[PDB]
Every structure is written in C-alpha cells, then in structure tokens.
Design a protein around this ligand. Sequence first.
Ligand SMILES: O=C(O)CNC(=O)C(=O)O
Ligand SMILES: [Cl-]
Ligand code: NI
Length: 365
Amino acid sequence: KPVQNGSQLFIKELRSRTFPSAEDVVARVPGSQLTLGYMEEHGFTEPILVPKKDGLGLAVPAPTFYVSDVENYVGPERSVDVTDVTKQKDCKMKLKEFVDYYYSTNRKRVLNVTNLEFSDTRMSSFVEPPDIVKKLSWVENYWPDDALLAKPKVTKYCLICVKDSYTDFHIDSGGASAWYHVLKGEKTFYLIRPASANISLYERWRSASNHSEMFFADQVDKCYKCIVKQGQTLFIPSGWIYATLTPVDCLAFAGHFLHSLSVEMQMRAYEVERRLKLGSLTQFPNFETACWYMGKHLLEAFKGSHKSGKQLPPHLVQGAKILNGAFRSWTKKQALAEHEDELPEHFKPSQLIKDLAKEIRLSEN
Ligand SMILES: O=C(O)CNC(=O)C(=O)O
Ligand SMILES: [Cl-]
Ligand code: NI
C-alpha cells in the first residue's frame, strides 16, 4: 500500500518529517550586496535568500494586492493551467473559476496555479524582476529587440497556492535559475544539491512509472528545508532539484533565466529533460535559440578581445567550448530539423562553429 505524492496523508506525513536546515547552505544577503561581483566570486552555486527587497531593484505591488486584484489585471476570461494537487493532475479553466474556488470556504479540493505568465497582461507593469537577474540573463542581454523569434515567455509568473498544496521534486526547465518572491503568506522549499549522482537519481526516479508513489528526498543524503516568508526573495541556482509545500495561502512572483555562470549545468539539465520527454507545460521555450544568441555574442567578444588586448575570463572560454559542443550536436546529420526551428534568422551555424572553435584555440594559445 503506497502513498500518493501530494495526498492529504502525504502532506500530514511531510509536515511531521525532520529535515536539515537550509542554514548551512542558503546565504542570507542584503539586496545591495547582490552584485555581479558577488555572483562571480561565489559562482551562484548555492541558493541565496534576500530577506528584504530593498536594494534589489525589484518592483512588486504592495502586500495589499490580492488574488482578486490578480483577476482584474490578468483578466477574468484568461485560460490558466490549474493543478489538482491531490491527484497530481493538471487541467484548464478560466481564471474567474479558479478565483471563485480560491475564495470559497469549505474547499473540498487542493488546487494551485503555478504556470501563469503575465508579461502579456495589464499586470505586467506592476512587476519588474530584480536588477541582478536583468544583469545575468542571457535573453535580456543577448536576444535582440528586432528578432523574428519571440523571446522566451518565462520572465514574470504569478503563483497562487492554497494551504496544503505541494509541488513535487523537479529541476526547472532549461536548468534555468530562478528568483522567487513571496508577496503574501509563506512557501517552504525542499532543496537538493545538483551533485552528479543526485541528478542521475532524479532522472531515474522521474522516468519511473511510480514516481508519484515515491518520496524522492528519501534517496539522497541531504534535502534542506527553507521557509520563504512574506517580502523575502529566494534565488535558486541552475540545476537544483526541489519541491515546495505551501503552509498557508500564498501569493508569489517568480521568473526564470539563463546565465554565464552555469553553462555546464544548464546543458546537463536540458539533456536530462530531453531524455525524459515530458512535455513539461513549464518548458523553457526556445532554450536553444537563447544559446545560439549567446554563442554569437561570445564570438563577438573573442573578436573584440584582439582589439582590446584583454583575454576573456576562463569561465567564458569554457562556456564557449560547452556551447560549441551543443551547437555541433544540434546540427549533426541526424540532428533533426526540430533543431532548425530554433535557429535565429541570419545564422550560419557551420560558420559560427568553425569561427568559435578558432577563437577558442587562439585564446588558449
Ligand atoms: O510555487 C511553487 O510552489 C512551485 N513553483 C515553482 O516550482 C517555480 O516557480 O518554478
Ligand atoms: Cl535568460
Ligand atoms: Ni519550479
């Protein structure tokens, strides 16, 4: 007799379990200290909690902004993805109907909205991602405004979760990093380090037919518990395997981004999700396109280095090597035309690869 993940009993069982504190792993940092220099010094390999939004350059509405306000600014008629936590099955419904449920007393069901991207709505102007995210983000820096392919629509999510909701262990799509801001309520994260063997266990667990009957954290050494409270912001690094529990009704904002400190992990995660073939619904759209733009940027940086007389930093050269490898796999004979759909206009992949390979050789000397 197995326990279904996200069921009433599961939650009761999970609430009772003791986990190691995120204390020893999650750094608490004031917003003004979260700079590019800080990220480079530490490598953004561990999650970071910023207890107050001051200095982050994050814009969000006041905590007097309610789910009812979300309905108004997003649009009552908007189709949204709703997860039935007690079944771990998703469905579609008008936001109006979810909001109706949310304000119901005697909720029979445990339902959440965790995929509402609002950048195309009136609510978009009320939220601006942290400055550090804009500084790190490959799309923000390298995807041109006049591009014929649409930017990955992953920059502004509104998360609405009722008390006792649960999101099972996962790695976010594209191995993207995340910022996560709790506006009202609190959100508990269960964090697992993306050590290589953990990643492999994760892939095997997730590919198993009975994954919903198995608590993944049982298979790893350390799963850290991190409570994120009202007004706090959590930055989750590339590749981290995590689940969440919602202790009280919670409203949160989040966004996802790729960056130059985790090229290797981004590719490893992308490779895993492609073998899993999930149709994630939360997929990082045009991950490959963002990588092509990064690759073009790196080539320009290499060429520029000859005029500046200053070498690119080692992690960028290593990043270039990893990207060039991916570029080769995506354009191989058998490498499909699913891959060609993600190539930006005006790209000559075989020429880019050859030019990057040469610049890398020159740089290494
Ligand atoms: O909000 C939650 O409980 C879970 N959200 C995520 O996993 C995410 O934003 O990527
Ligand atoms: Cl990005
Ligand atoms: Ni997630």
